[PDB]
């Protein structure tokens, strides 16, 4: 009877199974169900996003196997946690992550039973790191135009969710849809160990490995001459006697730094034998 700005404290395994489900999720779009717990009104959590069989027929509401639901929750009951579904996921791995024409039915088909049933759109087949590729929305309906479409209660969460506001047919779909807010949990219980294995492993394992050293320097110094002659083809172009050149057109760099850190590596490699030996 009241509307507040929600929040999704994600288990990272949710997005991990979404990225596996999208990476291995061959760009034919696919459907599944989301499993969390409705904590309160202004927040929700997703603790789990489970897997589906290879339903390569079409995304529809019929694709949910209820015996798979029963056995899935049962195998969670013989495991430690018998949690509750919060909704449904799906995958849009080819195009620009916007609500398909079956989703516009199955969202309210699922939230006729559940409370919120927030959609989750994914596309890890965008590119590799710097996009934030996750997309979630909350179906507002024509029943709720009675009062205004403005929860607003905690603001600047929907204000920074409003800060992109950018997908073509979705900002067309301000109608029927207001998004939900997705932050990523204080995950130090896993971010701790991801950091620790990450840097205890992504440098030489046991880290006694490199401590290749010199014929790579031979090839690198021949690089560092073969490009240095075209490096020095620039101060002749700085002799414009008076002035005949629009702005510096600067090619000083990229051969300071390579020489700098590469021969830092070579001099500390010359250290390395006098280091390992005593």
């Amino acid at each position: 009877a009241v509307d507040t700005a929600e929040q999704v404290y994600i288990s990272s395994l949710a997005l991990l199974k979404m990225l596996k489900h999208g990476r291995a999720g061959v760009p034919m779009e696919v459907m599944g169900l989301m499993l969390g717990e409705f904590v309160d009104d202004y927040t929700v959590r997703v603790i789990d996003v489970f897997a589906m069989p290879q339903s390569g027929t079409g995304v529809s509401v019929e694709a949910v196997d209820p015996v798979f639901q029963a056995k899935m929750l049962d195998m969670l009951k013989q495991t430690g946690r018998p949690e509750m579904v919060v909704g449904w996921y799906h995958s849009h791995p080819g195009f620009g992550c916007w609500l398909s024409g079956v989703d516009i039915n199955t969202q309210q088909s699922f939230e006729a039973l559940s409370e919120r049933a927030v959609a989750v759109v994914v596309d890890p087949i965008q590119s590799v790191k710097g996009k934030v590729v996750i997309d979630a929305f909350r179906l507002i309906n024509a029943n709720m135009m009675v009062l205004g479409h403005e929860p607003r209660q905690t603001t600047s969460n929907l204000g920074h969710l409003n800060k992109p506001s950018i997908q073509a047919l979705i900002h067309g779909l301000n109608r029927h849809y207001y998004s939900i807010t997705i932050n990523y949990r204080k995950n130090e219980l896993e971010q701790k160990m991801l950091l620790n294995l990450h840097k205890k492993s992504w440098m030489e394992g046991l880290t006694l490995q490199d401590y290749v050293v010199k014929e790579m320097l031979e090839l690198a110094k021949n690089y560092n001459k073969a490009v240095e002659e075209e490096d020095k083809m620039t101060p002749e172009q700085l002799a414009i006697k008076n002035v005949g050149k629009q702005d510096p057109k600067r090619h000083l760099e990229e051969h300071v730094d390579v020489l700098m850190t590469s021969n830092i590596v070579q001099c500390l490699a010359a250290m390395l034998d006098t280091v390992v030996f005593k």
Binding site: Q153, T154, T155, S156, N157, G159
Partner: protein, 95 residues
């Protein structure tokens, strides 16, 4: 400060405001008639010279720049006691 997070934070600025006015309270109910001067130009009277009239409790709204150019009166029944430099509610003495 951060009133998006909680809309009552925008309400919470109650205790943050003190008056810039001038009050001739010699006796707690008494309303006397004093006329001192504010030596600013009379365009600091802009409320959205020779002298001023800032007395007669309501008190008169004052400017802090007006609070540093003031001068006590000489002809009233009530020529004050302390040299005045603080606003709000202040001193008065009969002479």
């Amino acid at each position: 400060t951060q009133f998006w997070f909680w809309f009552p934070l925008s309400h919470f600025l109650s205790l943050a405001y003190t008056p810039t006015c001038v009050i001739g309270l010699n006796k707690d109910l008494k309303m006397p008639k004093v006329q001192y001067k504010s030596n600013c130009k009379p365009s600091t009277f802009a409320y959205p010279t020779a002298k001023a009239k800032k007395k007669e409790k309501n008190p008169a709204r004052v400017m802090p720049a007006q609070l540093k150019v003031l001068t006590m009166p000489e002809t009233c029944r009530y020529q004050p006691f302390k040299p005045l430099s603080i606003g709000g509610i202040i001193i008065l003495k009969d002479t």
